[PDB]
Amino acid sequence: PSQPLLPQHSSLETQLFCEQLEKIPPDSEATLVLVGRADFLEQPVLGFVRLQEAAELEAVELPVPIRFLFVLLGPEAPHIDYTQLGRAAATLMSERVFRIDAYMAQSRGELLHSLEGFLDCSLVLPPTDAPSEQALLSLVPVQRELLRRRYQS
């Protein structure tokens, strides 16, 4: 082990939602996303694995078979938060058009094409000095057409 050299920033979701299994469908399959830091590795690496048959692994305690494996390992680099990288990978896996595309992918190019439309239909909200909560509602049409653009070709 070791203590990370780069400064530690507390998880935003932990500071927001944490501080205070029957919903799983019966035929659902599990996806495991593993993020780790390794000073010895030259560059961050991505490992995506789809199993031929869904298998129960000791990694997941739930009785949900594992189909997909996400492995994101790398050294400490600026603008790289591996918790946030794993969150992004898990959110991408949770997306509908991406899942169905990961299930049907026969090459890395299909997965890359699917992640491009996720980014094309993603709404980036820049910092503003006055959060009004009403100018936010003005972007409802924007959200609806970026979804019509992901659900459509």
């Binding site: 509908r96 058009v97 169905i100 299930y103 049907m104 659900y151 459509q152 070709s153």
Partner: peptide, 11 residues
């Protein structure tokens, strides 16, 4: 629902 998706995405 997944054939609905894949069909919508294929035109």
């Amino acid at each position: 629902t997944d054939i609905v998706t894949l069909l919508l995405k294929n035109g």
